[PDB]
Amino acid sequence: QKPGETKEVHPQLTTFRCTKRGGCKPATNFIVLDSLSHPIHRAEGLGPGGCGDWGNPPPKDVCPDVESCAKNCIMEGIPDYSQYGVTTNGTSLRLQHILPDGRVPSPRVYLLDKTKRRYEMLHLTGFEFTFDVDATKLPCGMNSALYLSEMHPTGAKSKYNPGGAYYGTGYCDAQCFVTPFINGLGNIEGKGSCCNSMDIWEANSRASHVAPHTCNKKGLYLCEGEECAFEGVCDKNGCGWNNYRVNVTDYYGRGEEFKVNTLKPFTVVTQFLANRRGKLEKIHRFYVQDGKVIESFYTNKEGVPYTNMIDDEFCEATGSRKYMELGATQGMGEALTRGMVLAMSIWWDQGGNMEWLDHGEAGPCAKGEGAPSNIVQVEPFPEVTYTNLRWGEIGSTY
Ligand X SMILES: OC[C@H]1O[C@@H](O[C@H]2[C@H](O)[C@@H](O)[C@H](O)O[C@@H]2CO)[C@H](O)[C@@H](O)[C@H]1O
Ligand Y SMILES: *[C@@H]1O[C@H](CO)[C@@H](O)[C@H](O)[C@H]1NC(C)=O
Ligand Z SMILES: OC[C@H]1O[C@@H](O[C@H]2[C@H](O)[C@@H](O)[C@@H](O)O[C@@H]2CO)[C@H](O)[C@@H](O)[C@H]1O
Task: Indicate which single residue of 96, 130, 143, 262 sits in contact with ligand Z (rule: CB under 6 A).
Answer: 143
- Specify the long-range contacts of residues 78-84, CB closer than 8 Å, at least 24 apart: 78/6, 78/8, 78/9, 78/33, 78/38, 78/39, 79/6, 79/7, 79/8, 79/9, 80/9, 81/9, 81/10, 81/11, 81/31, 81/33, 84/33, 84/37
Instruction: For residue 183, state whether it binds ligand Z (rule: CB under 6 A).
Output: no
Task: Indicate which single residue of 197, 270, 353, 396 sits in contact with ligand Z (rule: CB under 6 A).
Answer: 197
Q: For ligand Z, which is the closer residue by CB, 173 or 383?
A: 173
**CB-based contacts of 302, cutoff 8 Å, min separation 6:** none
Instruction: For residue 199, state whether it binds ligand Z (rule: CB under 6 A).
Output: yes
Q: Determine what percent of the chain falls in helix, strand and coil, rounding each to the nearest 5.
A: 15, 35, 50
Task: Indicate which single residue of 347, 374, 393, 398 sits in contact with ligand Z (rule: CB under 6 A).
Answer: 347
β-strand pairing of 260-261 with 252-253: parallel
352 binds, among ligand Y, ligand X, ligand Z, none (CB under 5 to 8 A by kind): ligand X
* CA 307 – CA 287 distance, rounded (Å): 17
Instruction: For residue 30, state whether it binds ligand Z (rule: CB under 6 A).
Output: no
Q: For ligand Z, which is the closer residue by CB, 56 or 247?
A: 56
For ligand Z (CB under 6 A), the number of binding residues is: 13
Of the chain, the end-to-end C-alpha distance in Å amounts to 42
143 binds, among ligand Z, ligand X, ligand Y, none (CB under 5 to 8 A by kind): ligand Z
Instruction: For residue 182, state whether it binds ligand Z (rule: CB under 6 A).
Output: no
> Segment contacting ligand Z (CB under 6 A): 63-71, 80-88, 93-101, 141-149?
141-149
190: exposed, middle or buried (C-beta count within 10 Å: 0-12, 13-18, 19+)? middle
- In angstroms, what is the minimal distance from the CB of 304 to ligand Y? 8
Q: For ligand X, which is the closer residue by CB, 1 or 329?
A: 329
Q: For ligand X, which is the closer residue by CB, 10 or 217?
A: 217
Output DSSP code: residue 36: G
Q: For ligand Z, which is the closer residue by CB, 8 or 199?
A: 199
Residue 284 · residue 273 · CB < 8 Å: yes
> If you compute the radius of gyration of the chain from its CA atoms, what whole number of angstroms results?
20
* CA 352 – CA 61 distance, rounded (Å): 34
Phi, psi of 310 (to 5 degrees): -75, 130
Instruction: For residue 311, state whether it binds ligand Z (rule: CB under 6 A).
Output: no
Q: For ligand X, which is the closer residue by CB, 70 or 211?
A: 211
Task: Indicate which single residue of 147, 244, 266, 272 sits in contact with ligand Z (rule: CB under 6 A).
Answer: 147
Q: For ligand Z, which is the closer residue by CB, 18 or 342?
A: 342
Instruction: For residue 345, state whether it binds ligand Z (rule: CB under 6 A).
Output: yes
Q: For ligand Z, which is the closer residue by CB, 143 or 271?
A: 143
Q: Which residues are near ligand X by CB under 6 A? A: 175, 211, 236-238, 240, 352, 356
Task: Indicate which single residue of 128, 173, 227, 369 sits in contact with ligand Z (rule: CB under 6 A).
Answer: 173
Q: For ligand Z, which is the closer residue by CB, 175 or 308?
A: 175
173 binds, among ligand Z, ligand Y, ligand X, none (CB under 5 to 8 A by kind): ligand Z
Q: Which residues are near ligand Y by CB under 6 A? A: 247, 300-302
- In angstroms, what is the minimal distance from the CB of 240 to ligand Y? 17
Helix (H, G, I), strand (E, B) or coil at 293: strand
Residue 135 · residue 204 · CB < 8 Å: yes
β-strand pairing of 23-33 with 108-112: antiparallel
**CB-based contacts of 45, cutoff 8 Å, min separation 6:** none
Instruction: For residue 235, state whether it binds ligand Z (rule: CB under 6 A).
Output: no
| Site residues (vs ligand Z, CB under 6 A) | 108, 143, 145, 147, 173-175, 197, 199, 202, 213, 345, 347
